[PDB]
Symmetry: C3
Subunit: 421 residues, 3 copies
């Protein structure tokens, strides 16, 4: 049996008091992780090559995930069964080297490690024909699925509270990779077409986006004994809310009191990213990110996000280093034009199983400092019924109350382990 997975777990303290707190900018879709993770998260994978005959094999893979608060020993939880799929390679003679798979699977996900941000992730139940040799590159075809909690009406209503039926969304993905646009550089190109798939006779709210597109172009350049990826993505309508390849075409959300509300996503998103990891000399490693994300919605409630951070690692020994992370976020409300921003600085002393900034397990002892100034927040007071500004960007002091995190500081510290195996 092959045993694989991912896990992080630790203990932490907040400078001003209590358990460790973590810091993410309001409106930002991520935070800089080092010394800024507040849960024990673990994926336990048990797979196995179950049959092989020459070139041909069938591989079976599973994945059970756990997320607990790490405030006690006995912490009961609901594990998520995330993967259960079978991959058959070289089963099709006419398309050599290609794999046919079916089942629940984490499919070719692209992410930026230091911000734990996935930018191209259509995982879920699915099926596909993978790595077909097109000569100049490899072509992959996949269909995966997701579903919104409500959004469909059994009959025609004008009342949004009637659209409570779960709505399936399908994604049809096509990728063409490993094309050497240049020396030390490859180009991947993807097209995602997602759409809400209604049961016979159901209906979506009038004006719901229904479908959309995600277009991706990723260029990888081998550099400084590392790499640099430069990404450009553009989404349309139903693909703009999740923004990673999954569709949300009903445009309906629910308050905690089960009230439906209209979160319509007609609009577009433009993401331009550049991240990588480079070694410089023998004593230095560094990962870096720079991103600009603009979600422009018809309804005016989008955001324009900018991030940058770097994570230099200095190796004292082949197994001991000092890692440092500095991250900066700035998010502007499409609705109000206000701006939330933050900068985090973490300093850690670590021990890792390797000499790379990618080496795991790592055991860290850190101190983090964050200072923010948020001038807007989302209005989640009231009910989708009470509140009519429910879920909308609103200034920090709107109507005497207060939104966003304010303008303060905080420092935390602790020890943590992270590992993938």
């Amino acid at each position: 049996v092959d045993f694989h997975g991912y896990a992080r777990s630790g203990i932490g303290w907040t400078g001003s008091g209590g358990e460790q707190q973590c810091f993410q900018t309001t409106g930002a879709q991520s935070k800089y992780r080092l010394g800024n993770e507040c849960e024990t998260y673990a994926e336990l994978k048990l797979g196995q090559e179950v049959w092989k005959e020459g070139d041909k094999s069938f591989y079976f893979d599973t994945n059970v995930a756990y997320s607990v608060a790490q405030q006690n020993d006995w912490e009961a939880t609901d594990p998520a069964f995330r993967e259960a799929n079978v991959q058959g390679k070289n089963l099709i003679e006419w398309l050599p080297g290609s794999t046919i798979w079916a089942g629940k699977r984490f499919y070719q996900r692209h992410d930026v490690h230091m911000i734990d941000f996935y930018y191209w992730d259509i995982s879920g139940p699915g099926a596909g024909l993978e790595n077909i040799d097109v000569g100049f590159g490899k072509l992959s075809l996949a269909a995966t699925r997701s579903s919104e909690a409500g959004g469909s009406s059994s009959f025609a209503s004008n009342n949004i509270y009637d659209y409570t039926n779960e709505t399936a969304n399908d994604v049809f993905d096509v990728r063409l990779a490993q094309m050497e646009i240049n020396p030390g550089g490859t180009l991947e190109l993807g097209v995602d077409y997602g759409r809400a798939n209604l049961r016979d006779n159901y209906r979506l709210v009038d004006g719901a986006s229904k479908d959309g597109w995600l277009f991706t172009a990723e260029h990888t350049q081998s550099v400084l004994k590392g790499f640099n990826k430069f990404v450009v993505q553009y989404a349309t309508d139903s693909m703009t809310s999740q923004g990673k390849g999954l569709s949300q075409g009903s445009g309906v959300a629910f308050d905690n009191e089960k009230f439906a509300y209209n979160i319509n996503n007609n609009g577009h998103m433009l993401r331009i990213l550049d991240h990588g990891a480079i070694s410089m000399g023998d004593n230095w490693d560094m990962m870096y990110v720079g991103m600009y994300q603009d979600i422009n919605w018809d309804n005016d409630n989008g955001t324009k996000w900018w991030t940058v951070g770097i994570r230099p690692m200095y190796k004292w020994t082949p197994i001991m280093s000092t890692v440092m992370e500095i991250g900066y976020d700035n998010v502007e409300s499409q609705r109000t034009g206000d701006k939330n921003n933050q900068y985090k600085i973490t300093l850690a002393q670590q021990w890792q199983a390797g000499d790379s900034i990618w080496s795991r397990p790592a055991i860290r002892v850190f101190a983090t400092y964050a200072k923010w100034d948020e001038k807007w927040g989302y209005d989640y007071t009231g009910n989708a019924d009470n509140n009519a500004n429910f879920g909308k960007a609103v200034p920090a002091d709107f109507n005497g109350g207060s939104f966003g995190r304010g303008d303060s500081d905080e420092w935390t510290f602790g020890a943590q382990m992270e590992i993938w195996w």
Copy 2:
């Protein structure tokens, strides 16, 4: 560590719209599975032979099951801890080859694969002395347990709503197998005696069945490089509701509003089954079922069910085939004499790790078509309190409303993987 289990997972679509739907006849205790399974189900077993000295060993086995809807990637769930037992073989000198076991265990279950129907399954917490050589055959002894959600009263009441205490049921099983009644044929004989086991001073509703019997006779005949099993079972009272070897002697059920209601099972059941799998030549494999099940209750709410289906497999290659399944159901209401019936036809193109119809993993790409006509359904409208016909068979149009699935059609299609390892 030995890693074993079962898992199926896929993606599907309904002809008329939305996620894949599955089709089972109202009153039928099963459906024909091919291209008719709508969940990701998986059992992950980790066991190990923990001690061995010569002929003697102790084996430890566990089983954790997961069932998710397969509509999203992150699907939190409550796994079922189904097995945790220790089997000690050859530990008793005077009864060589026999095993003593204790713990939660899937014990010698008999099922019909294509309809995923278990007809002899007394699994659960238990203990036993297994495979004792009686000379002409092997004798097995086991005691297992189950419990109904309510059914017991702490005191005497005339009000069914008072019988809300969980009621333990015990099964005492004796089997005598591997007797060669003939050439290429064996005979197994079993006797199950189940009974509700009340706490000191509790009582069951007046007239509750309390106990019952299940008698099984299974004949296996080696044929056409395969087998054919012919089964005949007869149950009495408390064993008729579950109908697989477990007892439900309280005769009390609960509506979703926590209302107790009387589901009394005094009566009997007669099951006559014949299934098998035969290879015919080199290019053909086929499994088949034919069953007649009559649950005749004193309360008149039983059913008389008839099924038949076949699943021919034609091998193009040793790893690629075309499988087809055709199934037919017909259930008649004991209470109303009406009839529900259905026929399903599925066509699949598969790739399996082997040349058998029993070879797994299998990766299928299918299309299913079902056409039904249901003339009765169960009344689950109202409350066990509001409704007094609650849970009873009622005609399709009863009192202007509508019961059963109607008279329609539907086709689905998709890809799926199934595997046992």
Copy 3:
């Protein structure tokens, strides 16, 4: 992958009727286990040495626990993710042989097997520097965490119902072990300092204990081919309620109707224990316990507990024995001076993978008999709001009602397996 764990599972019956019942004295913090365990409990550990270079290694360990009632086969549950940690040995040159760990971990827990009582257990999320060679012994340093369900107020209130915020408690542990005070005898010394760690601006109820100490001294003496441990512990205030090394400094509890109530623990605890396991000859093994525990609270609601039991094992064969357990409990109410007492006697026939009383797997077939006489119980009638004596020791017949288990008997019997691997 290393597969390890613990599991017990069985089937049982109560003499007077129904599923097996188990017997523990009111006020006692444990029961004598043999033939007195009523659940299927299992810990499945999957770990692995992930990197090794010479003397240095990184080990990764996990632990997922399950507890089900064992009354049915399908029993859905919420597993507890109890361990996910990484241990790095010999990573620090100046402190050879020492381990640095971080993550959730069962840390050096001390327990008495026959009563399944842990007396020194600070496990949970944590981090530490383990086994530092101090020359005359090994020094260990650890910081772990726990948190109470409520206990903190966002603002100052005089109303206990306002203290509903979860309150983190930190433990700082220092141990010095393996000192040979004598021949065949070692001495371990520990100091635990626990404290409630409030968020900036939160407050604890007026008079809440806040912090406390646990002092441990354990002497192990190699004897009769076995050992004998003699323990003496003394706790103060916040460490007296849990009494194993974890802190509960808020002093606030909640009724099932979510009502806060004051369970203040200022006071002290004195525990004096002696347990061991000795072999006597070739045909006899025996474990034994004797303990006196005095929890003296300022609020007068403590207890003075005395236990003693022995578990002789007589080996007929190297794999078959007859085990017997006799246990006695006596608990006196600090508040009322009344006394609850019980004696249990179990007789079992077992088969184990080994000739020791510590050999597992063990498959038992037993009969247990318990006879008790309880003259007090805790008042949990009403609400923390209705009842003002809620949670207090009260005589058996207090105000006409009845508290405690009474004065009766009962016998049970069944089969069970227990195993650690």
